[PDB]
Write a protein that binds this ligand. Structure first.
Ligand code: NA
Length: 355
């Protein structure tokens, strides 16, 4: 059976709690506000925005001593062609030393700030364009759709468009018309550049395209996509000893989004469909003992699975193959208790029994 109320309760159980949601909101709010008002950086800092699984509403509740994490991307106007990545990153060391002494560390492509209630990542980026194209891109990056403080789940009406404005419950004759994503010719081939200290160069990154694709795929799947990502992450967590360390995080989310068809009608149907499609689509790659290439949504030349090994991918494929038999039999069951017991064999005790 589909057991839609049971899946709703399960999802409520595996989402980040209200306390954790407020914690990441508070942390990001404070960090961005202190960045905004820091005089030594007001010339280079164009804007800031949120990225990460919590921003995309594809994150599950942290377990035990782990804390929620969000990334604050800092869009600057630095010239990446005339400044080394390390210099651009070190421009932000006085800020961290003033506001987060003893709690920040330098990482490969960002800074990591560790608070007791949240973990923050400060991502310094630059705009490669110049002139009118840079002006239009800055118009986009200063819009309310980019600056938003709400997660994807909290704003169904969100689009990647500089004309989009948030809605607080009610609005009528003013503007009840839904805007759409800006045409791809305005952003798709315009990624930001990001310092890489271990490679010592500026690489391309396009978080806005990733967020936009996530939101559109959730709309095309009637809001089931982010919840399916969460459910699969929870399944992986409950069976971590039987699964390889990777894929996890965004590569796992990307695999899920690739496997899932549009038009999903329920969580159970979506799970079975995405698992069957994953198994048939990558059966040849798996038999080759290889791994698939899957391009990043914003940088087509980047492979999301670049760091995944073929061995880990094939181990994960076998894990999905074992989970898919349980999922198919759970969906096919016509008894509520049997169906819920199979769903619980997949997901654990956070999935409830009807009675
Ligand atoms: Na798909």
């Amino acid at each position: 059976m589909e057991l839609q109320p049971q899946f709703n309760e399960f999802l409520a159980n595996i989402r980040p709690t209200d306390t954790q949601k407020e914690d990441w909101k508070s942390g990001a709010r404070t960090l961005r506000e202190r960045l905004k008002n820091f005089e030594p950086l007001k010339e280079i800092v164009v804007s800031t925005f949120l990225q990460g699984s919590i921003r995309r509403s594809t994150a599950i509740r942290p377990l035990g001593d782990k804390r929620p994490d969000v990334d604050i991307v800092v869009v600057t106007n630095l010239d990446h062609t005339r400044m080394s990545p390390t210099d651009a990153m070190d421009l932000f060391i006085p800020f961290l030393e003033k506001y987060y002494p003893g709690k920040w560390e330098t990482q490969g492509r960002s800074f990591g700030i560790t608070l007791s209630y949240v973990e923050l990542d400060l991502v310094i980026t630059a705009i490669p364009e110049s002139g009118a194209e840079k002006s239009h891109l800055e118009q986009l990056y200063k819009s309310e759709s980019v600056l938003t403080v709400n997660s994807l789940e909290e704003q169904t009406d969100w689009r990647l468009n500089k004309s989009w404005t948030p809605n607080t419950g009610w609005l009528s004759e003013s503007n009840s018309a839904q805007v759409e994503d800006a045409p791809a010719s305005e952003w798709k081939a315009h990624p930001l550049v990001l310092p890489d200290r271990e490679k010592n160069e500026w690489g391309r990154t396009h978080p806005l395209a990733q967020i936009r694709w996530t939101a559109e795929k959730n709309r095309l799947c009637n809001g089931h996509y982010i919840n399916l990502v969460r459910a699969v992450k929870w399944w992986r967590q409950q069976n971590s000893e039987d699964l390889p360390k990777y894929p996890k995080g965004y590569p796992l989310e990307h695999l899920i989004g690739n496997a899932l068809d549009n038009g999903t009608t329920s969580m159970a149907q979506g799970l079975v469909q995405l698992m069957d499609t994953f198994l048939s689509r990558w059966a040849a790659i798996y038999n080759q003992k290889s791994k698939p290439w899957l391009s990043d949504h914003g940088v087509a030349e980047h492979d999301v699975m670049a760091r995944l090994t073929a061995e880990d991918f094939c181990s994960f494929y076998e894990g999905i193959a074992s989970a898919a038999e349980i999922a198919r039999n759970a969906l096919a069951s016509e008894e509520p208790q049997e169906s819920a017991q199979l769903w619980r064999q997949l997901f654990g005790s956070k999935f409830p029994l009807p009675g």
